[PDB]
Amino acid sequence: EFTLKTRLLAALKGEPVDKVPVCSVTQTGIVELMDVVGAPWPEAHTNPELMAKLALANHELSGLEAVRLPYCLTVLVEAMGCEINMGTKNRQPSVTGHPYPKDLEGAAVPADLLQRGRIPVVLEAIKIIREKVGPDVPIVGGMEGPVTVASDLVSVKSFMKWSIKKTDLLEQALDIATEASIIYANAMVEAGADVIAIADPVASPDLMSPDSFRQFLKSRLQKFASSVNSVTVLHICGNVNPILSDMADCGFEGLSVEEKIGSAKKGKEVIGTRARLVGNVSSPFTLLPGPVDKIKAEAKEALEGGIDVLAPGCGIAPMTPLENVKALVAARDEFYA
Numbered sequence: 001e002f003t004l005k006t007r008l009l010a011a012l013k014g015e016p017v018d019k020v021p022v023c024s025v026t027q028t029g030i031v032e033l034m035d036v037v038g039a040p041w042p043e044a045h046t047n048p049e050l051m052a053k054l055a056l057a058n059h060e061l062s063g064l065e066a067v068r069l070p071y072c073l074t075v076l077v078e079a080m081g082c083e084i085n086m087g088t089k090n091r092q093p094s095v096t097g098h099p100y101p102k103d104l105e106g107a108a109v110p111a112d113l114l115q116r117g118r119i120p121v122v123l124e125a126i127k128i129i130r131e132k133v134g135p136d137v138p139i140v141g142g143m144e145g146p147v148t149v150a151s152d153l154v155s156v157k158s159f160m161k162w163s164i165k166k167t168d169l170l171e172q173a174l175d176i177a178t179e180a181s182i183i184y185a186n187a188m189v190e191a192g193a194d195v196i197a198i199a200d201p202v203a204s205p206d207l208m209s210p211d212s213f214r215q216f217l218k219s220r221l222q223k224f225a226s227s228v229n230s231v232t233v234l235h236i237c238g239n240v241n242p243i244l245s246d247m248a249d250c251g252f253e254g255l256s257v258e259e260k261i262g263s264a265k266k267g268k269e270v271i272g273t274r275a276r277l278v279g280n281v282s283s284p285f286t287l288l289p290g291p292v293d294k295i296k297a298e299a300k301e302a303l304e305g306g307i308d309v310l311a312p313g314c315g316i317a318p319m320t321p322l323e324n325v326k327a328l329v330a331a332r333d334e335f336y337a
């Protein structure tokens, strides 16, 4: 007698379950569903009712066993003072202006952070989702993680340069970013999110050295996971093998990883008992192009490999067909006959 909610939480914590849940902890907005239910980007980023409507659509039509919102990695950084290009129907919002590119004078978490930007759109959409689906479906709150938030406060160019030349500034930014991150994450929990999933691409070995991850980044990610009042998941895009074992020490229940790093079996060997593994079906090379049977085959492989929560490896590409998302769920059902 698991519910979708109780199973997800049990899975992520490593407690026994009847079967692996199938859902996404990464963004679920797809153009096919934007068209069906009339909730296109960018308006689905700015209006809580359309945000709700599109999230629910990739639950109710796809069979993914959670509702995930929002669709972008800019809500918090914008509330922190970044300027955002809101993008288009298939191009996600992106940061164009950084509030503290040359120094951190005056940089703080604003006392009224939660009223700023689109924070109130996300909190309201969570409440709308909860009211519609009820207590037995889990709500995953997505956000940019503290490394990426720090990098957006100061520009990635300043962030990289300070990492070598002004580590005090690097650390001050990381500290403000972590504080803001915890505040927003807890707000999503208070609004009704069951899992907080952070996406922190700047922490990737593709952008920051593994040595820098261990020296500066790990401690902030540890502080986040410890201070946030829910089950959490850490997603770091890219070739994360050189830090996978360090990720597993950060205190997140789950780690969300891309197909790129190898098999689920291999990932489980690295992380051991320290965290669970969420993933890993390739968003750009399997889920987006299909075909359906290739998605089911790679799903099956992750399940056999011991994945804890079957999911896309990264955010779903916006042009992913609905039937390709449904092929994930079908693979899971098939595994259990």
Ligand SMILES: [Mg+2]
Pocket: 306, 307, 308
């Ligand atoms: Mg397991």
Ligand SMILES: [Zn+2]
Pocket: 235, 236, 237, 238, 258, 313, 314, 315
């Ligand atoms: Zn990713």
